[PDB]
Write an enzyme that holds these catalytic residues in place. Structure first.
Site, PDB file in Angstrom:
ATOM      1  N   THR A  48       0.864  -1.178   0.000  1.00 31.54           N
ATOM      2  CA  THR A  48       0.000   0.000   0.000  1.00 31.54           C
ATOM      3  C   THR A  48       0.887   1.209   0.000  1.00 31.54           C
ATOM      4  O   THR A  48       1.751   1.400   0.792  1.00 31.54           O
ATOM      5  CB  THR A  48      -0.999  -0.040   1.199  1.00 31.54           C
ATOM      6  N   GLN A  49       0.650   2.100  -1.036  1.00 30.09           N
ATOM      7  CA  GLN A  49       1.618   3.150  -1.439  1.00 30.09           C
ATOM      8  C   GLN A  49       0.894   4.386  -1.961  1.00 30.09           C
ATOM      9  O   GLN A  49      -0.244   4.306  -2.355  1.00 30.09           O
ATOM     10  CB  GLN A  49       2.598   2.663  -2.549  1.00 30.09           C
TER      11      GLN A  49
END
Lengths: 249, 216, 234, 233, 238, 245, 73, 246, 48, 246
Positions: free
Chosen positions: B1-2
């Site tokens: 998750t970015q």
């Protein structure tokens, strides 16, 4: 055959047997004699240079006998144009051997490295066959002074007296005949070298313009290779000359 | 998750799919960090005569994609006399590119929404920075996906597709909310619609204002 | 089949034992402009017929005696393209040499290295040899040099030789007139005469270029400077 | 200088017509498909009993459970097998089940016509395969034997015999074998047919027998093992 | 003869013979019918054989389980394209993730087949291929011939004596679109019977049938799995 | 003889005593075997008109490939060997594809034609691959230099034209174009004009039975190369029929 | 076309279709072909020359022969 | 017969003929006569001027779109003479070579260096076994910012020679002879003079004299930092001046 | 009218003609002629 | 160039020209015989081409490629005694053998090197410009298993194992001769194994047994070259028994 299936080396013979090599052997005979004789304190090479003309710049004394390494020298019999790539190649191999082994390079090892390139050119890559026979002269501590003969094809043999050039057949038998073993010295092999060189060659005079003479002599356990300069060469010729002169009318 | 720290961002790309058309609103503002350098900016491009592409998040990563999709489209139309490319192949091949560039840890996200019809079907495709392709009823990516999309989801939850009028009221509601809640953007939107002739969407103009909660 | 295929190729060997190709290349140089090179032993001179006739040649940046490096020049005969690549490679190799030793290259090492390159085309098949015969002049180590490199990829040492139109006649004059050790000024005079044998149609107001190599270095000379020597001995 | 391929006016490759004639010179290969295995029988082409029947490359392994027998030019076959072999063992590593005998057959037929040199490709051949192959191996649907020939004709076979007389090899197959019957008899039929195309009468020395079964899988036979299957002439 | 030994030898017509000689192999090779409706694409093939102890040669090949081909000509060249095409399909799902359009692939092969007809001496591929496919657009019946020229056709028949099949396709141009999966198959048999003599008709064992369309994925039918399709025997004129 | 059909075309590494190799002259003959492709240039686009030779009426669109889409403003109408037609389409197109990525803008036709022409001549030089032997036209509408029409023949010569026709009736057709006007007038008036030239030139010793295909690349289609609509095609054709009779 | 006038014109022969199939056959060769086509037809119990009949005639007239070397032929 | 000899390899793969010049190279010159483009270039002190037939056979062609003047550097220009197929291929090649160089050297190219460099590239085409030499001549114009206006010409094989005045074409020998008189009795140059002299010599040799929409004259003047095509407007003015001049 | 390429007798055709001559003279019957015909390339009737 | 001349042409023979022709060379110059024994598989050569001033160390006609595999050859072609062709094949085959040890241990088997060598000549038939090597090597050795093997390769690259096989001076002749001498007794006894080799060599006897050089090689152990002096001991006695059979 009735027609070659050669005209390239990316196509091959109508027998699978390569004609071009037999024409190459004939090519050494066209060019001047190259002979090597063995000595008991050195080895020497005697070769007939391409230049016979009076006008020579003479910056080089090496134009068929090239000193490659700090242990070995070679000579050319055949086309001069071919040596130039070969001589620079031989320098690379010769120093390459030292880097790993750091030993007085044997004559059998240098010759096998070169034979790999000559056999490939004849097989493929579309490169024309060689037309030079090269004579390698060197010293190792494991058999002594040696002389090797290399052929255009990649065919090799260790000799201690061999000659090619100006009809090979005659010349090798003659060089052998006059050669003696264990009776030798460097000065006398050199005097003899001119004498044999004279007989195979049409000239009964011979000069340092016609000829170029090299020594390989071992001093204080290390091999010093030099191709000699013209005044030094002349002295070996004059030594021979008195004898040659008596033969004549 | 970015989510990389974006420099030059387009914050929002609105999208709702209807029966033969799509209505898209695209943010006029181009924030280059805090400073809003350029408003004029339409982020929706014309690839070809039956395709369109609209993206939000980094604008640089967008301009690199528009020429690349241009060369992919140019290879495909050659084969026919008027053949046009379907949404799914171009969007999915780009998905594989972004999944690879995500793994490379210094990169910048962009998330695009493609509308095309090159099949026997009108396709609405997405390639994301994270990557994936899906169908959607109503869509929004990036900063829309985070905050308005949930408002959209709320709507979508008992009534699967909204009406025309109701989508307009939401649009109007939405622009207020983004200026108020997110930073970089402005109220200013361009209305862009894609159809079977190309993409038409004139220059971004100002629309309803309210950064007032003095009145609340 | 016949001799035609076998003999011509440099993808396989000539059945003669020596290649009929390098001989072909010399004929090319015969069809070229006449060039003489003579090492005086006070300097070197390279002279060639350069076609002006009205001054139809730029002599402000393009010449026929052309510098490779500071003190090396070349004068040529035969095929023009083959040479241009040969010049550019030769200067490149020279510059690698000047870079490393910090001395511009001498003629005697250069011809040998240059010969290795020309040999590669004489080895490679589908690739023809370079059809230029070069006269290399130089002054390095305090001694002037003149070398001849033929199209085969071999180098030969000469004190004076001739190329181009009627080379057989040039070499005969050179041996006859030339003496070891001379003055560079007397040497130009016989070089202009060497050209004059097979010039073709004879010299106008200036239709030759000469370049000198000496103690101070190789310089191609200007049309005026060139003209002064031609009055003395045409 | 010149091309590579030359079509004849008949509408077919000259080199491919020559490649068929290529087959007539060599060994023979018979394969007989049963639902209990595929057997491949081939002659080495004997001339002395000093030539071992113990280990001779005529039946070679494409995979652990696929054996391939060759006829025509023997030597050239070992190169076709090697290319099939790399594809087949990668597939076997991955699948851990079976590598379709049919795929392998389709792959080799690509090598038959591909050839270029003289300003086309250095990676492609200068010749056509004048090899015909019988790939016999065991697969998940069942034991399968496929036939390939120099024209590249991939066909599925229940039973096929190919040899130095293609008409001869099959005609003997008509007499002796019938599709369905025991494993033991399929080997029996291979040998009789093999003797017929061959000059000389059958012996242990002249042939090599290798059976690929789902039960035993590829077995390369040695001299003691050869005497057993010889019993049934 | 001389033009085709090389390729760089051009003719006095101005057309290369290597391509023309390559077309004649297609005349040697098996008769095929390829037809489409507008929901389905049907490949009806004639199988030929070397032994009848061996199973008759499968002339419907799996390229993918949505496009398939039927080959007429040189088999080695066919198989080479078969594999090439197969990999292209695999590539297309791998990157794009969808069923490959027939149209993207005929053009791609058409680019590739041109290259060796131009390469010095090299072949143009002496095989004509009929690709029957159902993708997202609907059915396509494509011709690649030894010439890199391709046709988009509704129904065509390539191979030995296929000309006789082509004439019956022209009468029934109207019927194709209109036809169901069953009906379109009966016309392929009608077209296929023309190829063969007026002494004989089709048998189960020399017919291979390949069906892809809306109703089901690409399945190839072998030796006696052809039967439910097969029934329908129409006129063969003398 | 100005050409030999065996000798000096054994390899593509040859020249001939006049100065031009015979293989290239044969390559002009290859284009003669096929029908005519005309393309007349406006200042608002280019309009092509190619007659497509038919053998069946089971043919549908994307058959013969007389019109190719080189770009989203570059059109191509071709004439000659259809086999050869596909590679020339690739060569122009690949040059276009690299161009689009890097430069980022619409291609000027002045650059494309010379750039491609280099490539067409480059096969002729090589004996790795044989000369081309189909002829094509490039017609573009751009804001880069306007509407421009070039023709590149298999030799590798690129020239400007307001009207070019390539075929076996190229000489007869080109003269015919010069008599009509189309130079300054819109694509909509022109389409009608491209059709009629094809019917009037249409001989029975240079061509065979054909179905008409015409194509846009101009302001009406908004840059992009599309085929003319069936309805429009049939009005352009209806004038073409009337004009012959 | 001219040859079909000489014998008879069947509904089956289509000149456009026929031209594609074959390559490089001239007038003389063609006459031999039409005579051959007729040979096939007489065997059938026909007078009509079928489209298949013309085709087959093409193969007998050249160097080609039944029972070909090739395994696709 | 003709130059060289068919025997052996020299057209199958490029290996020298008896002449020592490639079979293809001698043939390569003949390729200019195939073209029909006859050019003369004259060098001023204010400009370098090239005058050539533009080869427009009909006004159906657009006179502007047809060209043979190319912009190959930032203000170096050239004209193409000879077989057109060779000519476009040389132009595009020259252009690559030109851009690379401009960057490396970092400033606009000398006319001499550019001609020298293309001359090296063309040897490459000669030497390679697949390829064959170019059949065209590139005549470069440009003003070197040291020496002044320079006119260079490269030969088909890639021969290089210096020129201050040059001609190329079918009638190469005749055009160079008319210009040779003019070089000898050198006029003082200006934009107008240099152009008048180039056209006049080309018009004697052909003996037709040019139309003002059928020639292309290309200049690199000191007033332009660009390569400029004269067009119909300028050429028409010099042409009416010729008749009256002498 | 036609061209036929004249080719040597096939494998059945040569076996059959040999059989006819073989019976006439003294031969051992079970004859190895079949094994040899198959082994060898195409052989004409004159040859047998 | 002609169709027949080219390396590509599969010829009416039904097999590629250059592969066929290499096969017709395996008689003449040098002779190599190898017979199989339980304790030693022994190869012997006659003719190392030595004048007995030439080094015998330089010329290897019996070279050990591995530490349990060795090979001896002969061949036909232009220029006698030709070391070169045989020598490249020794160099690539020996390195490959040492590389095999490094990858997958212990002395490498007889049959594997022989498979590698036969395929090495084969791959060349596809490869550009390359014809196959005309060489037949009698690969003599013991496996790691210790199972004695005698293998032979041919110029196309098809290999077969044999109990005993002979090549050169007419391959067919020496093979036939060796078959009278071979017996199952010969393989069991250590004295007879050597004599079997020598017995094939002698039908083209030249210059003593000093000309003839034999090696014995054992299960995992290096090549042991028996003295040129030992060989002579067998020849004097045997040569008499030899005269009688032929």
């Amino acid at each position: 055959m009735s027609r070659r299936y050669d005209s390239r080396t990316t196509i091959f013979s109508p027998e699978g047997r390569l004609y071009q090599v037999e024409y190459a052997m004939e090519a050494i005979g066209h060019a001047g004699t190259c002979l090597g004789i063995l000595a008991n304190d050195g080895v020497l090479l005697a070769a007939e240079r391409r230049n016979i003309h009076k006008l020579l710049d003479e910056v080089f004394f090496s134009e068929k006998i090239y000193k490659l390494n700090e242990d070995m020298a070679c000579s050319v019999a055949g086309i001069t144009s071919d040596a130039n790539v070969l001589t620079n190649e031989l320098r690379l191999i010769a120093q390459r051997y030292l880097l790993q082994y750091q030993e007085p390079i044997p004559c059998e090892q240098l010759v096998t490295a070169l034979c790999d390139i000559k056999q490939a050119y004849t097989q493929f890559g579309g490169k024309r066959p060689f037309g030079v026979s090269l004579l390698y002269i060197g010293w190792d501590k494991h058999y002594g002074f040696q002389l090797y003969q290399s052929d255009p094809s990649g065919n090799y043999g260790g000799w201690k007296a061999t000659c090619i050039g100006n009809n090979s057949a005659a010349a090798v038998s003659m060089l052998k005949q006059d050669y003696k073993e264990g009776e030798m010295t460097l000065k006398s092999a050199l005097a003899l070298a001119v004498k044999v060189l004279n007989k195979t060659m049409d000239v009964s005079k011979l000069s340092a313009e016609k000829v170029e003479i090299a020594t390989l002599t071992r001093e204080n356990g290390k091999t010093v290779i030099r191709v000699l300069k013209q005044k030094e060469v002349e002295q070996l010729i004059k030594k021979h000359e008195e004898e040659e002169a008596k033969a004549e009318r | 998750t970015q989510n990389p720290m974006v420099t030059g961002t387009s914050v929002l790309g609105v999208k709702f799919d209807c029966g033969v058309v799509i209505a898209a609103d695209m943010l006029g503002s181009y924030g280059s960090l805090a400073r809003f350098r350029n408003i004029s900016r339409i982020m929706r491009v014309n690839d070809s005569t039956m395709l369109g592409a609209s993206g939000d998040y980094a604008d640089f990563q967008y301009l690199k994609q528009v020429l690349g999709q241009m060369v992919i489209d140019e290879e495909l139309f050659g084969d026919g006399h008027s053949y046009s490319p379907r949404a799914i192949h171009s969007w999915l091949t780009r998905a594989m590119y972004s999944r690879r560039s995500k793994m490379n840890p210094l990169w910048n996200t962009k998330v695009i929404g493609g509308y095309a019809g090159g099949e026997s079907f009108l396709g609405y495709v997405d390639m994301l920075g994270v990557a994936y392709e899906a169908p959607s009823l109503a869509t929004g990516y990036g900063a829309y996906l985070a905050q308005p999309l949930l408002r959209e989801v709320l709507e979508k939850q008992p009534v699967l597709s909204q009406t025309e009028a109701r989508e307009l009221v939401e649009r109007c509601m939405r622009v207020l909310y983004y200026r108020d809640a997110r930073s970089y953007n402005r109220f200013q939107v361009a209305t862009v619609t894609e159809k079977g002739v190309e993409i038409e969407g004139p220059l971004s103009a100002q629309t309803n204002w309210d950064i007032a909660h003095m009145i609340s | 089949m016949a001799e035609r295929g076998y003999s011509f190729s440099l993808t396989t060997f000539s059945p003669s034992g020596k290649l009929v190709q390098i001989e072909y290349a010399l004929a090319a140089v015969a069809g070229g402009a006449p060039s003489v090179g003579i090492k005086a032993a006070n300097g070197v001179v390279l002279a060639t017929e350069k076609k002006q006739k009205s001054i139809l040649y730029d002599e402000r940046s393009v010449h026929k005696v052309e510098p490779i490096t500071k003190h090396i020049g070349l004068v040529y005969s035969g095929m023009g393209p083959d040479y241009r690549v040969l010049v550019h490679r030769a200067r490149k190799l020279a510059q690698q040499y000047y870079l490393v030793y910090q001395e511009p290259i001498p003629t005697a090492q250069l011809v040998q290295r240059v010969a290795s390159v020309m040999q590669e085309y004489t080895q490679s098949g589908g690739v023809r040899p370079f059809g230029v015969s070069l006269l290399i002049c130089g002054w390095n180590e305090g001694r002037p040099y003149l070398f001849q490199s033929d199209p085969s990829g071999a180098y030969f040492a000469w004190k004076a030789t001739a190329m181009g139109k009627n080379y057989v006649n040039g070499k005969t004059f050179l041996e006859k007139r030339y003496n070891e050790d001379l003055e560079l000024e007397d040497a130009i005079h016989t070089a202009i005469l060497t050209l004059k044998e097979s010039f073709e149609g004879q010299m106008t107001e200036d239709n030759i270029e000469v370049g000198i190599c000496n103690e101070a270095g190789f310089r191609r000379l200007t049309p005026t400077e060139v003209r002064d020597y031609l009055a003395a001995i045409a | 200088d010149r091309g590579v391929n030359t079509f004849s006016p008949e509408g077919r490759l000259f080199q491919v017509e020559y490649a068929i004639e290529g087959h007539k010179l060599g060994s023979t290969a018979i394969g007989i498909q049963t639902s209990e295995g595929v057997c491949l029988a081939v002659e080495k082409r004997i001339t002395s009993p000093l030539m071992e029947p113990s280990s001779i490359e005529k039946i070679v392994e494409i995979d652990a459970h696929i054996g391939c027998a060759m006829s025509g030019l023997i030597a050239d076959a070992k190169t076709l097998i090697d290319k099939a072999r790399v594809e087949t063992q990668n597939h076997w590593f991955t699948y851990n089940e079976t590598m379709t005998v049919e795929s392998v057959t389709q792959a080799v037929s690509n090598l038959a016509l591909q050839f270029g040199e003289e300003d086309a490709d250095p990676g492609a051949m200068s010749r056509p395969f004048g090899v015909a192959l019988l790939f016999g191996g065991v697969d998940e649907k069942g034991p399968q034997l496929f036939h390939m020939d120099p024209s590249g004709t991939f066909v599925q076979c229940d039973a096929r015999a190919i040899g130095s007389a293609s008409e001869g090899a099959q005609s003997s197959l008509q007499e002796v074998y019938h599709k369905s019957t025991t494993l033991k008899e399929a080997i029996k039929s291979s040998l009789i047919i093999l003797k017929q195309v061959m000059e000389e009468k059958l012996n242990a020395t002249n042939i090599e027998l290798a059976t690929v079964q789902p039960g035993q899988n590829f077995h390369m036979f040695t001299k003691e093992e050869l005497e057993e299957v010889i019993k049934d002439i | 003869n001389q033009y085709d030994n090389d390729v760089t030898v051009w003719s006095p017509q101005g057309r290369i013979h290597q391509i023309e000689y390559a077309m004649e192999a297609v005349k040697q090779g098996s008769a095929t019918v390829g037809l489409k409706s507008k929901t389905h694409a049907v490949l009806v093939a004639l199988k030929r054989a070397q032994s009848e102890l061996a199973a008759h040669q499968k002339k419907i090949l799996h390229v993918d389980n949505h496009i398939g081909i039927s080959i007429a000509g040189l088999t080695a060249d066919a198989r080479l394209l078969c594999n090439f095409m197969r990999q292209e399909c695999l590539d297309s799902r791998f990157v794009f993730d969808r069923p490959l359009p027939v149209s993207r692939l005929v053009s791609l092969i058409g680019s590739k087949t041109q290259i060796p007809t131009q390469r010095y001496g090299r072949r143009p591929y002496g095989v004509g291929l009929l690709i029957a496919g159902y993708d997202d657009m609907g059915p396509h019946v494509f011709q690649t011939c030894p010439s890199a020229n391709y046709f988009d056709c509704r129904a065509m028949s390539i191979g030995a004596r296929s000309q006789s099949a082509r004439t019956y396709l022209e009468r029934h141009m109207s019927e194709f679109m209109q036809c169901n999966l069953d009906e379109l198959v009966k016309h392929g048999l009608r077209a296929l019977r023309e190829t063969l003599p007026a002494e004989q008709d089709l048998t189960t064992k020399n017919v291979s049938i390949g069906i892809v369309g809306k109703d089901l994925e690409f399945t190839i039918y072998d030796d006696d799995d052809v039967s439910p399709f097969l029934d329908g025997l129409e006129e063969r004129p003398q | 003889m100005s050409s030999i059909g065996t000798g000096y075309d054994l390899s593509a590494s040859t020249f001939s005593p006049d100065g031009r190799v015979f293989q290239v002259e044969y390559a002009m003959k290859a284009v003669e075997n096929s029908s005519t492709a005309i393309g007349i240039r406006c200042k608002d686009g280019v309009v092509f008109g190619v007659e497509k030779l038919v053998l069946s009426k089971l043919y549908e669109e994307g058959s013969n490939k007389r019109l190719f889409n080189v770009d989203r403003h570059v059109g191509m109408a071709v004439a000659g060997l259809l086999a050869d037609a596909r590679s020339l389409a690739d060569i122009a197109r690949e040059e276009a594809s690299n161009f689009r990525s890097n430069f980022g803008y619409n291609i000027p036709l002045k650059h494309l034609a010379d750039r491609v022409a280099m490539y067409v001549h480059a096969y002729t030089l090589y004996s790795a691959v044989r000369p081309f032997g189909c002829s094509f036209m490039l017609g573009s509408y751009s804001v880069n230099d306007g509407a421009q029409l070039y023709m590149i023949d298999p030799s590798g010569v690129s020239y400007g034209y307001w009207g070019c026709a390539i075929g076996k009736a190229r000489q007869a057709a080109k003269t015919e174009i010069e008599k009509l006007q189309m130079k300054e007038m819109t694509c909509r008036d022109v389409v009608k004009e491209v059709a009629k030239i094809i019917y009037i030139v249409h001989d029975e010793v240079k061509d065979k039975a054909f179905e008409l295909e015409l194509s846009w690349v101009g302001e009406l289609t908004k840059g992009r190369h599309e085929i003319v609509p069936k309805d429009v095609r049939e009005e352009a054709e209806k004038y073409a029929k009337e004009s012959l009779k | 076309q001219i040859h079909s006038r000489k014998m008879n014109v069947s509904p089956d022969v289509n000149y456009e279709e026929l031209a594609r199939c074959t390559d490089d056959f001239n007038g003389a060769q063609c006459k031999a072909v039409c005579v051959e086509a007729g040979m096939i037809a007489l065997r059938r119990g026909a007078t009509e020359l079928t489209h298949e009949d013309y085709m087959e005639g093409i193969l007998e007239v050249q160097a080609k022969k039944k029972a070909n070397l090739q395994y696709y032929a | 017969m003709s130059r060289g000899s068919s025997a052996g390899f020299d057209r199958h793969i490029t290996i020298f003929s008896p002449e020592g010049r490639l079979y293809q190279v001698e043939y390569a010159f003949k390729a200019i006569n195939q073209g029909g483009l006859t050019s003369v270039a004259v060098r001023g002190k204010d400009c370098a001027v090239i005058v050539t037939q533009k080869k427009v056979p009909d006004k159906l062609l657009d006179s502007s779109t047809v060209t043979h003047l190319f912009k190959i550097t930032e203000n170096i220009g050239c004209v193409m003479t000879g077989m057109t197929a060779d000519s476009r291929s040389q132009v595009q090649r020259a252009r690559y070579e030109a851009a690379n160089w401009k960057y490396k050297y970092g400033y606009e190219i000398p006319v001499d260096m550019l001609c020298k460099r293309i001359a090296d590239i063309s040897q490459v085409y000669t030497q390679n076994a697949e390829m064959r030499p170019l059949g065209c001549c590139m005549i470069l114009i440009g003003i070197d910012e040291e020496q002044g206006p320079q006119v260079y010409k490269c030969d088909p094989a890639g021969y290089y020679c210096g020129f201050k005045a040059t001609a190329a074409g079918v009638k190469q020998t005749e055009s160079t002879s008319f210009l040779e008189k003019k070089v000898k009795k050198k006029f003082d140059w200006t934009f107008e003079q240099t152009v008048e002299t180039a056209i006049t010599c080309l018009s004697t040799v052909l003996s037709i004299d040019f139309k003002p929409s059928e020639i292309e004259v290309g200049v690199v003047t000191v007033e332009n930092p660009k390569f400029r095509i004269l067009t119909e407007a300028e050429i028409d003015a010099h042409l009416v001046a010729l008749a009256e001049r002498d | 009218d036609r061209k036929i390429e004249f080719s040597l007798p096939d494998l059945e055709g040569r076996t059959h003609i040999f059989k006819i001559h073989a019976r006439s003279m003294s031969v051992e019957r079970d004859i190895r002629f079949e094994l040899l015909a198959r082994l060898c390339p195409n052989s004409t009737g004159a040859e047998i | 160039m002609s169709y027949d001349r080219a390396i590509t042409v599969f010829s009416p023979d039904g097999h590629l020209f250059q592969v066929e022709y290499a096969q017709e060379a395996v008689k003449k110059g040098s002779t190599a015989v190898g017979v199989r024994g339980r304790d030693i598989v022994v190869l012997g050569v006659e003719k190392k081409s030595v004048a007995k001033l030439q080094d015998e160390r330089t010329v290897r006609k019996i070279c050990a490629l591995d530490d349990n595999v060795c090979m001896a050859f002969a061949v036909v072609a232009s220029v006698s005694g030709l070391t070169a062709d045989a020598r490249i094949v020794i160099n690539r085959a020996r390195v490959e053998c040492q590389s095999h040890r490094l990858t997958v241990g212990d002395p490498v088997t007889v049959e594997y090197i022989t498979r590698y060598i036969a395929s090495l000549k084969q791959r060349y038939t596809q490869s550009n410009g390359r014809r196959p090597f005309g060489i037949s090597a009698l690969i003599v050795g013991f496996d790691f298993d210790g199972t004695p093997r005698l293998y032979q390769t041919d110029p196309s690259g098809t290999y077969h194992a044999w109990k005993a096989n002979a090549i050169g001076r007419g391959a067919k002749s020496v093979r036939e001769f060796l078959e009278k001498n071979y017996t199952d007794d010969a393989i069991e006894t250590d004295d007879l194994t050597i004599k079997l080799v020598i017995k094939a060599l002698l039908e083209v006897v030249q210059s003593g047994g000093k000309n003839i050089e034999l090696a014995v090689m054992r299960r995992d152990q290096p090549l042991k070259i028996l003295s040129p002096e030992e060989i002579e001991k067998y020849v004097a006695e045997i040569e008499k028994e030899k005269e009688e059979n032929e």
